[PDB]
Motif scaffolding. Structure first.
Motif, PDB file in Angstrom:
ATOM      1  N   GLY A  11       0.801  -1.249  -0.094  1.00  0.00           N
ATOM      2  CA  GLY A  11       0.108  -0.131   0.202  1.00  0.00           C
ATOM      3  C   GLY A  11       0.935   1.138   0.171  1.00  0.00           C
ATOM      4  N   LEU A  12       1.789   1.299   1.034  1.00  0.00           N
ATOM      5  CA  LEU A  12       2.721   2.501   0.906  1.00  0.00           C
ATOM      6  C   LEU A  12       3.747   2.759  -0.202  1.00  0.00           C
ATOM      7  N   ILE A  14       2.831   1.529  -3.291  1.00  0.00           N
ATOM      8  CA  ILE A  14       2.251   2.024  -4.535  1.00  0.00           C
ATOM      9  C   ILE A  14       2.035   3.365  -4.536  1.00  0.00           C
ATOM     10  N   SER A  15       1.617   4.071  -3.392  1.00  0.00           N
ATOM     11  CA  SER A  15       1.037   5.268  -3.152  1.00  0.00           C
ATOM     12  C   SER A  15       2.330   6.376  -3.126  1.00  0.00           C
ATOM     13  N   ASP A  16       3.464   6.171  -2.177  1.00  0.00           N
ATOM     14  CA  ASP A  16       4.407   7.065  -1.760  1.00  0.00           C
ATOM     15  C   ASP A  16       5.574   6.851  -2.361  1.00  0.00           C
ATOM     16  N   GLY A  17       5.997   5.535  -2.842  1.00  0.00           N
ATOM     17  CA  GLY A  17       7.144   5.025  -3.590  1.00  0.00           C
ATOM     18  C   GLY A  17       7.089   4.270  -4.913  1.00  0.00           C
ATOM     19  N   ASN A  88       4.808  -9.278  -7.996  1.00  0.00           N
ATOM     20  CA  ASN A  88       3.831 -10.493  -8.407  1.00  0.00           C
ATOM     21  C   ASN A  88       2.585 -10.167  -7.311  1.00  0.00           C
ATOM     22  N   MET A  89       2.870  -9.964  -6.092  1.00  0.00           N
ATOM     23  CA  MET A  89       1.743  -9.770  -5.165  1.00  0.00           C
ATOM     24  C   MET A  89       0.732  -8.322  -5.781  1.00  0.00           C
ATOM     25  N   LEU A  90       1.531  -7.596  -6.519  1.00  0.00           N
ATOM     26  CA  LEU A  90       0.630  -6.534  -6.939  1.00  0.00           C
ATOM     27  C   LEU A  90      -0.047  -7.014  -8.224  1.00  0.00           C
ATOM     28  N   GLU A  91       0.055  -7.698  -9.083  1.00  0.00           N
ATOM     29  CA  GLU A  91      -0.347  -8.416 -10.313  1.00  0.00           C
ATOM     30  C   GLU A  91      -1.489  -9.204  -9.384  1.00  0.00           C
ATOM     31  N   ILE A 105      -5.711  -1.410   2.098  1.00  0.00           N
ATOM     32  CA  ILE A 105      -6.237  -0.206   2.173  1.00  0.00           C
ATOM     33  C   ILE A 105      -5.807   0.942   3.330  1.00  0.00           C
ATOM     34  N   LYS A 106      -5.522   0.515   4.306  1.00  0.00           N
ATOM     35  CA  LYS A 106      -4.790   0.999   5.414  1.00  0.00           C
ATOM     36  C   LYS A 106      -3.593   1.737   4.852  1.00  0.00           C
TER      37      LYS A 106
END
Ligand SMILES: [Mg+2]
Ligand SMILES: [Mg+2]
Length: 174
Positions: A11-12, A14-17, A88-91, A105-106
DNA sequence: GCCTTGCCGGGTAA
DNA sequence: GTTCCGGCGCG
DNA sequence: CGCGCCGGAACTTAC
DNA sequence: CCGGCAAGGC
Protein backbone atom coordinates in the motif's frame (compact mmCIF):
# COMPACT_ATOMS: atom_id res chain seq x y z
CA UNK A 1 2.00 -12.19 10.30
CA UNK A 2 3.67 -11.85 6.89
CA UNK A 3 0.62 -11.41 4.63
CA UNK A 4 -0.75 -8.45 6.57
CA UNK A 5 2.49 -6.51 6.82
CA UNK A 6 3.17 -7.23 3.13
CA UNK A 7 -0.15 -5.82 1.96
CA UNK A 8 0.31 -2.75 4.14
CA UNK A 9 3.82 -2.14 2.81
CA UNK A 10 2.60 -2.64 -0.78
CA UNK A 11 0.00 0.00 0.00
CA UNK A 12 2.73 2.45 1.00
CA UNK A 13 4.92 1.48 -1.99
CA UNK A 14 2.15 1.88 -4.57
CA UNK A 15 1.20 5.27 -3.26
CA UNK A 16 4.29 6.95 -1.86
CA UNK A 17 7.15 5.03 -3.43
CA UNK A 18 7.51 2.44 -6.16
CA UNK A 19 8.99 -0.69 -7.69
CA UNK A 20 11.81 -0.12 -10.13
CA UNK A 21 13.76 -2.32 -12.53
CA UNK A 22 16.86 -0.32 -13.60
CA UNK A 23 19.46 -0.69 -16.37
CA UNK A 24 22.80 1.05 -16.04
CA UNK A 25 25.92 1.71 -18.13
CA UNK A 26 26.50 -1.64 -19.69
CA UNK A 27 25.05 -3.85 -18.77
CA UNK A 28 24.36 -3.43 -15.11
CA UNK A 29 21.00 -3.54 -13.38
CA UNK A 30 19.17 -2.90 -10.17
CA UNK A 31 15.82 -3.80 -8.65
CA UNK A 32 14.43 -1.37 -6.13
CA UNK A 33 11.63 -1.37 -3.62
CA UNK A 34 11.02 2.22 -2.57
CA UNK A 35 8.92 4.19 -0.10
CA UNK A 36 9.45 7.97 0.17
CA UNK A 37 8.28 10.11 3.08
CA UNK A 38 8.74 13.67 4.35
CA UNK A 39 9.36 12.53 7.93
CA UNK A 40 12.68 10.75 8.51
CA UNK A 41 11.34 9.86 11.91
CA UNK A 42 8.29 8.07 10.57
CA UNK A 43 10.57 6.11 8.19
CA UNK A 44 12.99 5.01 10.92
CA UNK A 45 10.44 4.40 13.64
CA UNK A 46 7.43 2.95 11.84
CA UNK A 47 8.15 1.92 8.24
CA UNK A 48 11.71 0.52 8.36
CA UNK A 49 11.23 -2.03 11.14
CA UNK A 50 8.14 -3.37 9.30
CA UNK A 51 10.21 -3.68 6.13
CA UNK A 52 13.03 -5.20 8.22
CA UNK A 53 10.61 -7.76 9.68
CA UNK A 54 9.56 -8.78 6.17
CA UNK A 55 13.15 -8.96 4.88
CA UNK A 56 14.09 -11.29 7.75
CA UNK A 57 11.05 -13.54 7.19
CA UNK A 58 11.79 -13.84 3.44
CA UNK A 59 15.53 -14.28 3.97
CA UNK A 60 16.31 -11.30 1.79
CA UNK A 61 19.93 -10.35 2.41
CA UNK A 62 19.72 -6.78 1.11
CA UNK A 63 19.85 -3.93 3.57
CA UNK A 64 17.38 -1.16 4.16
CA UNK A 65 18.81 2.10 2.92
CA UNK A 66 17.59 5.51 4.04
CA UNK A 67 18.65 8.22 1.62
CA UNK A 68 18.17 11.95 2.16
CA UNK A 69 16.79 13.88 -0.81
CA UNK A 70 15.80 17.51 -1.35
CA UNK A 71 12.13 17.28 -0.55
CA UNK A 72 11.77 13.89 1.17
CA UNK A 73 13.53 10.88 2.61
CA UNK A 74 13.70 7.59 0.69
CA UNK A 75 13.43 4.10 2.11
CA UNK A 76 15.02 1.80 -0.43
CA UNK A 77 15.77 -1.90 -0.63
CA UNK A 78 17.91 -3.06 -3.53
CA UNK A 79 16.70 -6.62 -4.06
CA UNK A 80 15.62 -8.60 -7.11
CA UNK A 81 13.81 -11.03 -4.77
CA UNK A 82 11.90 -8.38 -2.83
CA UNK A 83 11.15 -6.60 -6.08
CA UNK A 84 9.38 -9.65 -7.58
CA UNK A 85 7.76 -10.52 -4.28
CA UNK A 86 5.92 -7.18 -4.42
CA UNK A 87 5.45 -6.94 -8.20
CA UNK A 88 3.85 -10.41 -8.29
CA UNK A 89 1.73 -9.64 -5.27
CA UNK A 90 0.57 -6.48 -7.06
CA UNK A 91 -0.47 -8.45 -10.13
CA UNK A 92 -2.47 -10.87 -7.99
CA UNK A 93 -4.12 -8.11 -5.96
CA UNK A 94 -7.67 -9.28 -6.87
CA UNK A 95 -7.06 -12.47 -4.89
CA UNK A 96 -6.32 -10.70 -1.58
CA UNK A 97 -8.13 -12.05 1.47
CA UNK A 98 -9.83 -9.78 3.97
CA UNK A 99 -6.78 -9.31 6.23
CA UNK A 100 -4.74 -8.34 3.18
CA UNK A 101 -7.44 -6.08 1.75
CA UNK A 102 -7.78 -4.20 5.01
CA UNK A 103 -4.00 -3.89 5.39
CA UNK A 104 -3.62 -2.67 1.83
CA UNK A 105 -6.40 -0.12 2.10
CA UNK A 106 -4.82 1.06 5.34
CA UNK A 107 -1.47 1.55 3.59
CA UNK A 108 -3.24 3.48 0.85
CA UNK A 109 -4.90 5.84 3.32
CA UNK A 110 -1.80 6.48 5.44
CA UNK A 111 0.09 7.38 2.30
CA UNK A 112 -2.49 9.33 0.29
CA UNK A 113 -5.73 9.76 2.23
CA UNK A 114 -7.59 12.82 3.47
CA UNK A 115 -5.75 12.97 6.78
CA UNK A 116 -8.02 15.73 8.17
CA UNK A 117 -10.77 13.13 8.66
CA UNK A 118 -13.37 15.87 8.07
CA UNK A 119 -13.75 14.14 4.72
CA UNK A 120 -12.67 10.58 3.87
CA UNK A 121 -10.91 10.46 0.52
CA UNK A 122 -8.21 8.57 -1.34
CA UNK A 123 -6.44 10.02 -4.40
CA UNK A 124 -4.78 8.15 -7.31
CA UNK A 125 -4.30 8.37 -11.11
CA UNK A 126 -5.05 4.66 -11.41
CA UNK A 127 -8.85 4.37 -11.65
CA UNK A 128 -8.67 0.58 -11.95
CA UNK A 129 -6.91 0.36 -8.59
CA UNK A 130 -9.50 2.54 -6.91
CA UNK A 131 -12.28 0.38 -8.37
CA UNK A 132 -10.85 -2.71 -6.75
CA UNK A 133 -10.69 -0.90 -3.42
CA UNK A 134 -14.20 0.43 -4.04
CA UNK A 135 -15.51 -3.11 -4.42
CA UNK A 136 -13.69 -4.25 -1.27
CA UNK A 137 -15.16 -1.36 0.70
CA UNK A 138 -18.67 -2.18 -0.48
CA UNK A 139 -18.32 -5.79 0.73
CA UNK A 140 -17.22 -4.33 4.08
CA UNK A 141 -20.35 -2.21 4.04
CA UNK A 142 -18.59 1.06 3.28
CA UNK A 143 -20.26 3.07 0.56
CA UNK A 144 -18.09 5.18 -1.66
CA UNK A 145 -17.86 6.93 -4.99
CA UNK A 146 -15.13 7.45 -7.56
CA UNK A 147 -14.84 10.56 -9.71
CA UNK A 148 -12.20 12.41 -11.73
CA UNK A 149 -11.08 14.92 -9.11
CA UNK A 150 -8.40 16.64 -11.17
CA UNK A 151 -8.83 17.31 -14.88
CA UNK A 152 -5.28 18.68 -15.05
CA UNK A 153 -3.35 15.54 -14.09
CA UNK A 154 -5.96 12.80 -14.52
CA UNK A 155 -6.13 12.15 -10.79
CA UNK A 156 -9.25 10.33 -9.62
CA UNK A 157 -10.68 10.49 -6.09
CA UNK A 158 -12.31 7.73 -4.07
CA UNK A 159 -14.67 9.43 -1.63
CA UNK A 160 -15.93 7.35 1.29
CA UNK A 161 -19.47 8.28 2.39
CA UNK A 162 -19.63 9.94 5.79
CA UNK A 163 -22.72 7.79 6.39
CA UNK A 164 -20.22 4.97 6.89
CA UNK A 165 -17.55 7.09 8.59
CA UNK A 166 -17.55 5.06 11.80
CA UNK A 167 -17.36 1.69 10.08
CA UNK A 168 -14.48 2.85 7.85
CA UNK A 169 -12.31 4.36 10.57
CA UNK A 170 -12.77 1.38 12.89
CA UNK A 171 -12.36 -1.33 10.27
CA UNK A 172 -9.50 0.17 8.29
CA UNK A 173 -7.63 2.70 10.45
CA UNK A 174 -8.28 1.46 14.00
C1' DG B 1 -31.32 24.91 6.75
C1' DC B 2 -27.86 21.70 7.44
C1' DC B 3 -24.98 17.85 5.49
C1' DT B 4 -22.77 15.61 1.90
C1' DT B 5 -19.92 15.59 -1.88
C1' DG B 6 -18.70 17.17 -6.90
C1' DC B 7 -15.60 20.48 -8.57
C1' DC B 8 -11.53 22.89 -8.96
C1' DG B 9 -6.93 25.82 -8.07
C1' DG B 10 -2.79 26.10 -5.51
C1' DG B 11 1.21 23.82 -4.06
C1' DT B 12 3.87 20.68 -0.93
C1' DA B 13 5.39 16.10 -0.68
C1' DA B 14 6.31 12.80 -3.02
C1' DG C 1 7.92 9.70 -7.29
C1' DT C 2 11.67 8.39 -11.32
C1' DT C 3 15.75 7.43 -13.31
C1' DC C 4 20.03 9.21 -13.83
C1' DC C 5 25.14 9.02 -11.80
C1' DG C 6 29.24 6.81 -9.42
C1' DG C 7 30.88 2.62 -6.87
C1' DC C 8 31.47 -2.41 -5.62
C1' DG C 9 31.26 -7.91 -5.93
C1' DC C 10 30.25 -11.97 -8.42
C1' DG C 11 30.48 -16.16 -12.09
C1' DC D 1 31.64 -9.38 -19.94
C1' DG D 2 27.06 -9.69 -17.99
C1' DC D 3 24.30 -8.93 -13.81
C1' DG D 4 22.96 -7.49 -9.37
C1' DC D 5 23.67 -4.77 -4.48
C1' DC D 6 25.30 0.04 -2.61
C1' DG D 7 24.89 5.32 -1.89
C1' DG D 8 23.69 9.64 -3.93
C1' DA D 9 20.62 13.13 -5.84
C1' DA D 10 18.92 15.91 -10.06
C1' DC D 11 14.79 16.05 -12.30
C1' DT D 12 9.82 15.69 -12.75
C1' DT D 13 4.77 15.70 -10.89
C1' DA D 14 0.92 13.13 -8.30
C1' DC D 15 -1.52 13.85 -5.03
C1' DC E 1 -3.24 16.62 -0.22
C1' DC E 2 -5.80 20.64 1.16
C1' DG E 3 -9.66 23.35 1.64
C1' DG E 4 -13.18 26.78 -0.14
C1' DC E 5 -17.38 27.06 -3.06
C1' DA E 6 -21.87 25.62 -4.14
C1' DA E 7 -25.53 22.49 -5.97
C1' DG E 8 -28.06 18.87 -4.92
C1' DG E 9 -31.15 16.28 -1.96
C1' DC E 10 -33.70 14.84 3.09
MG1 LIG F 1 0.93 7.72 -5.55
MG1 LIG G 1 2.02 10.68 1.18
Amino acid sequence: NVSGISAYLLGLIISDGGLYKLKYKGNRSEYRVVITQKSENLIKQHIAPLMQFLIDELNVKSKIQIVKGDTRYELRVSSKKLYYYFANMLERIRLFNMREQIAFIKGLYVAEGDKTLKRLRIWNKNKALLEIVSRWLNNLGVRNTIHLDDHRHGVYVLNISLRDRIKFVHTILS
